[PDB]
């Protein structure tokens, strides 16, 4: 019988979870899956506008998802049934400022500006840093293609989700929270295995799942070459037909390595590549135009 | 109303059969998976003596299985709880001959050397190649570890499928008939998912699933690097720390493709290998001794 | 619109003797000549297209002597290269396989949805339906060269009329390709000229160039089972007109040799 | 043989203020030292063992106003590299993670297979029984430097007697290692020298050196909390004597320098 009429603030809140079992059935088409993943953490931010990270809800994404990889891999239509997102935290009352979460329908589509823009999108939440809250995503009946080779976003994915954070004090916690998603799959059609690599050139062609991505912004050229992974096996091997100014420098990284050399007309280099934040890359190659070569990246 | 005490026989045989649907079911442990694969086809031999063919049975297999190499990755314990195998002609009653098939429980074991010590195994089958058997595999109860890095085979493996045939005529069909496995696993851990890609160096160190080997025979060196599938995807890139001789030979195969030198100090190669055959090999590197270096093989 | 039904037939199949299998593939979409025979001209007036009903067929015309298996299989995407091995060509759900001097059938699930019937640039996912994928492993030498006939049986509906396509195919040296797809021009050298690739079976393809120029030498013929050239090339201006029949897919029949970019005008007409 | 249940301390958290995580592992066999502190006195004494039960404890002690996260878990494969990820750690079936101003148990079950108690070269698949990760990645500066502890109950099974294995560890530096794995020694240059890594957490670890030559310099402390030597080495024949007090894995406290391969004799003891 306690007092409605007044409330409390505490200290801090504790929210405890252990590990779920994930379920898998079969059926007359194909198969069915329900289970849960991590996506990331959140970090501080002490300005007054919101900056943003994105996630693409494919089923072949190695960025969003770590274990329905190896299952899709056998199958080519998908239809999700449920999508629920779940934000934990890890810090105290003394902390004060606001995150945000929200859902889009177009995969090719950049972030919104303004906070007032932000706030127009329908279905988004927003809470203070010491709480909890949960988004609820509502599903439609449209089977789509998994994510291989180039295609039209709009084709193939089915959204994005958006969280951001603004406005914190000068001293504060260090990171705010973690984000986890439960899901329900259903898989239609069976083939054969296929390779977990990725295999391109420069001429805009790529040929496996999505895992890293180049910009040229070019300015004596200068090649980018941006992860979207943290899965700290990346190793990407380089075939060069002409001769290059320089080759295998390190940007903003973790950790570089390269074994071969690059001033050779035929040359083929090896590096590997520690990620330990989203978006790092750790190649940078300047040459006089756009050039002809073979490039293969693969995790582990 | 048929005269059993009067038999006949036919020009050829004809057996039809489609495709089968698996099975994959969750329980208490772990899963459990049904399903059915294809192995190998048979040539003749116009010799007295036969000729064998070798399949090692492990679920992390990639030159016996196909599709549970995706959901063996996810779990470290296995236990088998049915096996059987089933040849399928193609050959007239004008090919005259035997056929045999058998099954023993020691994995690091060579091949017997003649037709007497053949019978002498428990189980074994054999009969004229225009017609169809079927070869059961009693199972015990024991888990034991999936097949990664460099391990004893008495430890990790469950057993060995032996395939002979010896006798045929001149003037003959080219192939004799295929050979399918049906099977019942159980899977016991869930665990982090694991890279397919093979690691080592020439000091006997690997450190992925089995898929090439590697045999030295030294006279002026000469390292033979044999290929244990089919799925003519194989890339393989070797590093260099010391001066070769000759580097990326054809040795005996259907293709090769090589991009980069190898007559420098430290360097870097890049092949592509098409297999047709079993046990074929598309390498054959000369040295003075046995050198420093890191090869990498990875299929598709 | 109209709903028809009809009987077709695609190709033979041919002796393998090698080690490694052969495939063939087939795309199934209204507007292609590799495929269809007389699906392509009512398909050519109208805009959209369904499927209601999907069968293959194959039938035997070997010896009970001859050893060996076919096989068959569909997929979903039509852009995808061909398996290697035998093992993934196996897994694919659906497949069959059977000894050359039996038939049998093949029956493929459809859905209810509408895609475009074209012919261009646009991606295979959204206006294709699937491919279908035969396999030829193991003959000996000893053995007839033909196996087989590969059949389909169909019912389909059109949906929207429209201004009908020309039959004929109209061309140049410098690549521009407009009409239905019959033939496909390749060149090595510029020395050595050019290669005519006939992707599709028929009797009486008739040929004819134009030269705005003079040439070192033309008509040759490399891999046609009948050839008749009556119209010679002399100088600037001249014609020429030719008339090939084609057995096989990729024959490469008709070779001429010239400078690097020639200028000049070719017609191609099937039947 | 004998049955016994207890409770033993391993080791306590440190706070992690960089953006990657840090894990630590634990290898549960009964012959390690960095696992057990008084089961290894009677497991020096028998040949195989049984677990029956098994459980895992963290006790806070660190201020309500501490943010961050803690996590545990435990696997099955002995030899395996520890993950790189946060996503590929939460897929272990059975991991646990809290704020750090509260506790949690882990609990493990067992199964009824006898295995032999032995340090040495064979293989981890047939001598042991799990491994125990814990991590630890956000906290901030202005955070205590210590979180909490890690405790263990257990039960367990000894089978066959057999004669006593010694305590003390004797070596040499030409590489001989026998009795317990208390210390390792590495190198990086010959005339730089040598560093003496102590793998363990205790206090009072005395070392003892003998040196069969002239040195130039010996007994030099690098990341001791504290050190005491009291006999010096001078020319062909000395003797030396040093306690060592250790608190974190892997300090390198001494650091004597000579030639490429001295001779001598090394004798290190706990306690």
Known sequence: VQKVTRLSAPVALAYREVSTQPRVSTARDGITRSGSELITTLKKNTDTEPKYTTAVLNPSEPGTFNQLIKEAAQYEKYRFTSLRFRYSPMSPSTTGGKVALAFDRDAAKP??????????????????????????????????????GISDPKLVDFGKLIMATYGQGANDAAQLGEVRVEYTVQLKNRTGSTSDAQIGDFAGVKDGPRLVSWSKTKGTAGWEHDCHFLGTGNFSLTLFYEKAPVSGLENADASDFSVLGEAAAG???????????????????????????????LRI
């Open 267 to 297: 040359s083929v280099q090896w590096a590997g590549v520690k990620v330990a934040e989203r978006g790092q890359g750790v190649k940078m190659v300047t040459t006089e135009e756009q050039p002809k070569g073979k490039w293969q990246a």
């Open 111 to 148: 972030p919104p500006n303004d906070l007032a823009s932000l706030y127009n999108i329908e279905g988004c939440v927003s809470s203070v840093p010491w709480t909890g809250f949960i988004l609820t995503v509502p599903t439609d009946s449209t089977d789509r293609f998994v994510a291989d």
